Amino acid sequence: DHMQTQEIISVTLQVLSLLPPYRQSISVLAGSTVEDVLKKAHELGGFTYETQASLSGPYLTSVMGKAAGEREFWQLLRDPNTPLLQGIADYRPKDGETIELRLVSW
Numbered sequence: 334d335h336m337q338t339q340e341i342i343s344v345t346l347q348v349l350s351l352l353p354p355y356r357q358s359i360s361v362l363a364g365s366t367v368e369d370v371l372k373k374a375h376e377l378g379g380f381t382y383e384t385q386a387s388l389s390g391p392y393l394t395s396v397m398g399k400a401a402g403e404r405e406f407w408q409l410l411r412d413p414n415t416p417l418l419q420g421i422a423d424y425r426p427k428d429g430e431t432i433e434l435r436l437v438s439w
């Protein structure tokens with residue numbers, strides 16, 4: 334029906350731009366967004382982050398207490414080393430995917 338998936342998937346959320354690195358397998362409903370994964374990692378796995386409103390949805394500004402500085406941003410990637418084409422509130426990871434948040438300068 335127009336109800337929710339029921340099948341639970343596992344998405345690995347990893348942050349290698351920090352010491353110690355963050356890596357946790359997160360269980361969400363199939364169809365959850367990256368933002369949903371962050372929320373669940375926050376609820377259960379001591380993950381913190383900040384966003385701010387944008388014209389194209391929430392923009393990720395800080396991860397695990399580390400804010401992006403000048404000419405820097407938290408890049409969203411799926412394994413292997415592949416930037417996402419959508420932001421956190423749009424991309425819906427598949428079962429077994431690894432989502433990486435990487436602090437990069439431009």
Ligand SMILES: [C-]#N
Nearest residue numbers: 406416417418
């Ligand atoms: C935006 N790239």
